Design a protein around this nucleic acid. Structure first.
Ligand SMILES: [Zn+2]
Ligand SMILES: [Zn+2]
Ligand SMILES: [Zn+2]
Ligand SMILES: [Zn+2]
Lengths: 198, 193, 198, 196
DNA sequence: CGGACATGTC
DNA sequence: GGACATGTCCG
DNA sequence: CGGACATGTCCG
DNA sequence: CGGACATGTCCG
């Protein structure tokens, strides 16, 4: 079993926070975020845009790390990883190791860490300021198993934790959101939002 | 020595409530109001509800502790039997020797009392969620009452105490527990009698 | 071709199969449909298959079972357990974890991966009926659902049962479709309901 | 890896004998010839007879060892359950983890094997008394077959071997054991199921 | 085992 | 959005 | 002693 | 599940 990372929102000295697109709940949607639940619903291997918003600009060398943990405390000390089938299915993007649930796409400077000591997986990219005319920096994440994958997540909900860190891995900022990876994100978002009514 | 089992509703009008789940031979947890007794299966979810007339201050804590019901056994610490103490069933948070765990709460804290040696488990008190009239804690009991070398078919009470952040008494309630393979079946053998 | 033959034939001992008549209660553990020649059964539950002969074959006769895919486009693919169930802790101490079909309650059981085809099979000595019985019952178990991703993945299989002499020469064969599923009764009823026109 | 359980009467014609016993509900110890199985209560005397055609040499010893009968459990060392191992019920000679004890014999030795981790108990072989045909050892079994964390409802075999003073095998036999609260009841049940 | 429903595919 | 295929939970 | 009962387990 | 049972404990 592994110690548990903090999931506490920390805006830090750069005013670090997250943003998400507004996508709707049509059954045709590949990734959609629920503000009410602070929860992303997405399809396996489809683009999940996460926006990085800051008040001041973090210094060059700053990195952005994403890590999954189980949301339920009775599972939180268990490492999150891909199921046996998907680990073997060779849908490699050329850089992500097969065991990793979360990938980043479109970024040559991506790095994957399979930690020596907690054994937890994470994916990290250098922080980049927003492009010209933009208020935020967007990272494209992929989740490589469904929440239901037997022998992996096994229908257990996860949280993704996003940390802004310095070149030595010291904490600068943190935010998190729950994720469900599922076949029909629009439908499932609607169901969980309806259950919130309750 | 023996921890108090005396009902004390206190200034917050603290009371316990239980799900009314009926008596199927193997329902996972059921409660008998006639006996004030919870019948539950080993390691399964055992909801216990905290009902208050007014909200205790934040920092308030909710502790649970098992004692033997019968006078001749009351001074003996309630613990898991030698077999279950050694099984591979740690949730990563709870001591393997503790009978009572709480599931679903990352702020769970476990105590072996340095003086009495008794085991207990504590969580922060939180008020009920919107739409709810009570706070539910999910307890697990990790041995059957019948376990040889543990409870050995001796009945226990669970004592639930409401405490301030320093451990001062704010409220107390309790209930008898039978942990068994067939809670529905057994509830009756005490409720058909 | 190289696909093993599935062609039913009784041969000189008048070899054929019988099944229990278990009905269609929703979650019955194993049931057989004569209209479909199809067994419906739950993962890892006892599946009684009866061997009936008109005359007793010789000492050293053996009885082999093998799965193949029923659809022509999948027939050349070896039927194996999915990676999840392969790696799960459900061993009986005898079966290879990769094998779909086990025999329970028989210490003389032997498992084969084919030299040339790599197809899996399970074989036991033929024994004549017990005193007072007219058939020999073998207890099979199927160790993945038809639905298992990374395994059968929703493709139908047939089970081929062969009676063989001690050198492996064929003496008789019978095949039947198998659906391994959570609700054998439900699914049998549904499939037979779907035979008729409105 | 399992010690052999193969019956080996050897050059001394080594056999075992058991009282012709009854099937009263809680008789302390009872052998089933039909099952080659002893049914006995925890900690009660279990007499076992040694029968030989030719007497073994001086320094011969008699060893008893339990193994699980069922093939998928055979690799596992038979030991007492965590509760009984900690019960303090030693007779002064048997280490507490050992399932099988010998009563009434101060020359008993208990072995914890450093290579195999199997437990066994061994006594010197003594020829039958005058006008006696056989030698009786009194064994005790210190967990029920049911004990969770120990045998856990798994049937066991007891293997009795004759060995020379250096531990070389002279003969071997075996029998099934159920340790249980009601040996006669269970004998009957198991013998009824024999018909099925 | 199996009503209710979770969750995937056509 | 849709109907269904086909699984798990907990009594 | 056997019967009743307490109480865990499993097939189908 | 639904009983049938497995298996220890208590009483007559
Ligand atoms: Zn997966
Ligand atoms: Zn226990
Ligand atoms: Zn599978
Ligand atoms: Zn024991």
């Amino acid at each position: 079993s592994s110690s548990v990372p903090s999931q506490k929102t920390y805006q830090g000295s750069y005013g670090f926070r997250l943003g998400f697109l507004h996508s709707g709940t049509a059954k045709s949607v590949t990734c959609t975020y629920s503000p009410a639940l602070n929860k992303m619903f997405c399809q396996l291997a489809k683009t999940c845009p996460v926006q990085l918003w800051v008040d001041s600009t973090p210094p060059p060398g700053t990195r952005v790390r994403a890590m999954a943990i189980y949301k339920q405390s009775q599972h939180m000390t268990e490492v999150v990883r891909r199921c046996p089938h998907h680990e073997r299915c060779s849908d490699s993007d050329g850089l992500a190791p097969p065991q990793h649930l979360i990938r980043v796409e479109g970024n040559l400077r991506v790095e994957y860490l399979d930690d020596r000591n907690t054994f937890r997986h994470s994916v990290v990219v250098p922080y980049e300021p927003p492009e010209v005319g933009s208020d935020c920096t967007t990272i494209h994440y992929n989740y490589m198993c469904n929440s239901s994958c037997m022998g992996g997540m096994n229908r257990r909900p996860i949280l993704t934790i996003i940390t802004l860190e310095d070149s030595s891995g010291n904490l600068l900022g943190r935010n998190s959101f729950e994720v469900r990876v599922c076949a029909c994100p629009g439908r499932d978002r609607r169901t969980e939002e309806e259950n919130l009514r309750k």
